Amino acid sequence: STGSATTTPIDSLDDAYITPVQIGTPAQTLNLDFDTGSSDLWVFSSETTASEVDGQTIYTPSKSTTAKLLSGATWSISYGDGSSSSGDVYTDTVSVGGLTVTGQAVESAKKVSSSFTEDSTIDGLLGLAFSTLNTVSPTQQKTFFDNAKASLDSPVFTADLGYHAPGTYNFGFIDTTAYTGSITYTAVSTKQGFWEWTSTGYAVGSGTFKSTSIDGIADTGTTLLYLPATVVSAYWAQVSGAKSSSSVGGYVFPCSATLPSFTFGVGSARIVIPGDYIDFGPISTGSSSCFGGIQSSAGIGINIFGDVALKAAFVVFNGATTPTLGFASK
Ligand code: NA
The missing domain is CATH 2.40.70.10 (Acid Proteases)
Known part of the structure; x- marks a missing residue:
C-alpha cells in the first residue's frame, strides 16, 4: 500500500x-x-x-x-x-x-x-x-x-x-520526480526515540564549509533550526545589526537586511537553505526588528533540524530494520 x-x-x-x-x-x-x-x-x-x-x-x-x-x-x-x-x-x-x-x-x-x-x-x-x-x-x-x-x-x-x-x-x-540529483542517506540513532542523525558541518553564505559533527533531530513539528551557539553566532555575525535579544527570546535582525544562505552537510552532500527561509518577519506587528529562523539550541539540550532546514530538502524517513534518513536537494 x-x-x-x-x-x-x-x-x-x-x-x-x-x-x-x-x-x-x-x-x-x-x-x-x-x-x-x-x-x-x-x-x-x-x-x-x-x-x-x-x-x-x-x-x-x-x-x-x-x-x-x-x-x-x-x-x-x-x-x-x-x-x-x-x-x-x-x-x-x-x-x-x-x-x-x-x-x-x-x-x-x-x-x-x-x-x-x-x-x-x-x-x-x-x-x-x-x-x-x-x-x-x-x-x-x-x-x-x-x-x-x-x-x-x-x-x-x-x-x-x-x-x-x-x-x-x-x-x-x-517519488523520484520530487527531488534533483541523488538522495544521500545517513545513520540514525533511535536511543532517544527521535530521528537523530549527525550533520557533517555547515557554511554561512558563500563562506568555506566547516567540517564538524552536529548531532540533531529531524523534527517537522519544530518551526526553526536550533544549532549550537558557536554555529548560530557565526551565521548572525554576517548580518549587519543582528543581535541576540533576551527580551524577545533569540536573535533578531533589521527587517531591511538581506540574509545569507546557510548550508548543512549530509555526509559528502550539502543542503542549502536560502536566506529568505531564515526570515520570520517582524517581532510584533509593524516592528522594524525581524525574528531569525536560526536560533541557539543552548538550554534545549538537543539540536533540532526543524522546518527551516527540512523544507530546503526532500527528506526520507527510512523505517527499515536499521532506520536511516535521506536528504536530496529539490
Ligand atoms: Na515566536
Whole structure:
C-alpha cells in the first residue's frame, strides 16, 4: 500500500503545516500537525474542556461506528515549547492520503494548553517519531507509521515541505520526480526515540564549509533550526545589526537586511537553505526588528533540524530494520 497527502502552511510564516486526516466511520476529517519529533496521535474532541476549544474541528467518537474506548488508557504530553495536552484513548480507523490503518490509537484531549487553544488551524498532532516515545499508559501505543509499516510497499515515509507553499507527505514510496540529483542517506540513532542523525558541518553564505559533527533531530513539528551557539553566532555575525535579544527570546535582525544562505552537510552532500527561509518577519506587528529562523539550541539540550532546514530538502524517513534518513536537494 501507499498514501500521499498534501501539507499546507498554517500562516504566511510557515509556522507549522497541517495535513488532512480521516478518522472514524463515517470519516471525520481533522487537520493535524505531522510531527517527526513526537509519537502521539492526539485530537481536539467532544471531550475537550469547552473553554479550551476556539475554532478547532473536533473528533466525536460517539458518532464513529468503528470507535472503541481503549479502557483505562490515558495520555499526557509536554512539548519543547512548554505546551501540553492530556486525555483518554479510543481506537479507530485512520486514513492519511488513501492509506488506512485499522485499530489506531486516537488520543482524545480532555485538556490542552493555551498555545493549542489559541491556534484554531491545528486540530491535533500526528506523531512520526519512534513508538518508544508514545505517552499512553498503562499500554504504550504505536504510531500511525509503525501500524502501517508492514502493509507499505517500502517501510518509509517522506517529507517534502514547501517554502510559503504546500508540500507533500508520502508513505510507502519514494517519488523520484520530487527531488534533483541523488538522495544521500545517513545513520540514525533511535536511543532517544527521535530521528537523530549527525550533520557533517555547515557554511554561512558563500563562506568555506566547516567540517564538524552536529548531532540533531529531524523534527517537522519544530518551526526553526536550533544549532549550537558557536554555529548560530557565526551565521548572525554576517548580518549587519543582528543581535541576540533576551527580551524577545533569540536573535533578531533589521527587517531591511538581506540574509545569507546557510548550508548543512549530509555526509559528502550539502543542503542549502536560502536566506529568505531564515526570515520570520517582524517581532510584533509593524516592528522594524525581524525574528531569525536560526536560533541557539543552548538550554534545549538537543539540536533540532526543524522546518527551516527540512523544507530546503526532500527528506526520507527510512523505517527499515536499521532506520536511516535521506536528504536530496529539490
Ligand atoms: Na515566536
